[PDB]
Ligand binder design. Structure first.
Ligand SMILES: Nc1ncnc2c1ncn2[C@@H]1O[C@H](COP(=O)(O)OP(=O)(O)O)[C@@H](O)[C@H]1O
Ligand SMILES: CCOC(=O)C1=C(C)NC(=S)N[C@H]1c1cccc(O)c1
Ligand SMILES: [Mg+2]
Length: 331
């Protein structure tokens, strides 16, 4: 029906890299949707590997650029009453969290609503209220933040429990491409002015998780879901009741223990090789997101890479992985 769309985003060099006068081994050509990597040698003469994707974003790409080109189109589909998922995949330190969540500009220069460093999640929540409050639509927004570490599930938005309490997952007797996560809390976001504090609470609880679990920020998978219940009444009088859900997934670092990460790779292989048996059941992540992998959910993957020569091997691994994913078909 529809191939999973894959986009690549290369981050810029940081301070420590700039001062060292580092030479980028990555060249991005958005118009041609290609990414080229210097696999050995220098700029005078050398070999390179090139890959074509659905979209390519170089180091000069700002958060708003990513939102306008990839997220906006997807959010519109969600608002039409469909389900969508966006994965962030890549080596630790390449920008998965920066892309999915973003961060705050230093010294309280901007409000969260205007911060140029804000990522996909905050921009999406803000825009949902902007677009639906604008037109004549009755709506409700609910969010949840589920995280997976060592194949255990945690609810990062429940203010009544601590990160030591794991959640139980069961098969949904009703629908077969889904599961039931007992205890997972869904928080109602009444208005745009309740967004930041809800996101902050999740961030604070995540800090306690990092203290209890080793390399939590690198080894955990985060699934932020936003569900929108709408009752739209056209200027003529017809009412259209629809429900849309968007899953924003920040995957564990791909650098080479993580059953969900290993299984995701195996699921993709089975899907692209057209193998009858797809191992969805082998991990919590793939059971939870089964409909996003060869299912009926519109899925996109943002593969993040580094431009530093020090990360050549992992950069190539990420590109090869992302290129293969382009052949997965959903409906
Ligand atoms: N596109 C980008 N533009 C500017 N800085 C970035 C970008 N991507 C990542 N960074 C910076 O690079 C570092 C890597 O961040 P992070 O998002 O945490 O990576 P990851 O989640 O993949 O481990 C951070 O200090 C972040 O601010
Ligand atoms: C305490 C600092 O928090 C953050 O930067 C963010 C949090 C909690 N949660 C998400 S999803 N993204 C970050 C965020 C939220 C709003 C505006 C921004 O520019 C960055
Ligand atoms: Mg991260």
């Amino acid at each position: 029906g529809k191939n999973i769309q894959v986009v690549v985003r290369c981050r810029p060099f940081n301070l420590a890299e700039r001062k060292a006068s580092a030479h980028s081994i990555v060249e991005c050509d958005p118009v041609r949707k290609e990414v080229s990597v210097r696999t050995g040698g220098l700029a005078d003469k050398s070999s390179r590997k090139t890959y074509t994707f659905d979209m390519v974003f170089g180091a000069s790409t700002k958060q708003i650029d990513v939102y306008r080109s990839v997220v906006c189109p997807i959010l519109d589909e969600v608002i039409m009453g469909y389900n969508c998922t966006i994965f962030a995949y890549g080596q630790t330190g390449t920008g998965k969290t920066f892309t999915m969540e973003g961060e705050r500009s230093p010294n309280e220069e901007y409000t969260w609503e205007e911060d140029p460093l804000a990522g996909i999640i905050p921009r999406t929540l803000h825009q949902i209220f902007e677009k639906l409050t604008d037109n004549g639509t009755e709506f409700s927004v609910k969010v949840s933040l589920l995280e997976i570490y060592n194949e255990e599930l945690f609810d990062l938005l429940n203010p009544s429990s601590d990160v030591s309490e794991r959640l139980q997952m069961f098969d949904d007797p009703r629908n077969k491409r889904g599961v039931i996560i007992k205890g997972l809390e869904e928080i109602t976001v009444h208005n745009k002015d309740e967004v930041y504090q809800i996101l902050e609470k999740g961030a604070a609880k995540r800090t306690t998780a990092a203290t209890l679990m080793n390399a939590y920020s690198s080894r955990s998978h985060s699934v932020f879901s936003v569900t929108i219940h709408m009752k739209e009444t056209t200027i003529d009088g017809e009412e259209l009741v629809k429900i849309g859900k968007l899953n924003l997934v920040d995957l564990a670092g791909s650098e080479n223990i993580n059953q969900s990460l290993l299984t995701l790779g195996r699921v993709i292989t089975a899907l692209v090789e057209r193998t009858p048996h797809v191992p969805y059941r082998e991990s919590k992540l793939t059971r939870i997101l089964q409909d996003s992998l060869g299912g009926r959910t519109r899925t996109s993957i943002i593969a993040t890479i580094s431009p530093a020569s020090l990360n050549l091997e992992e950069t190539l691994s990420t590109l090869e992985y992302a290129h293969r994913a382009k052949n997965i078909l959903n409906k």
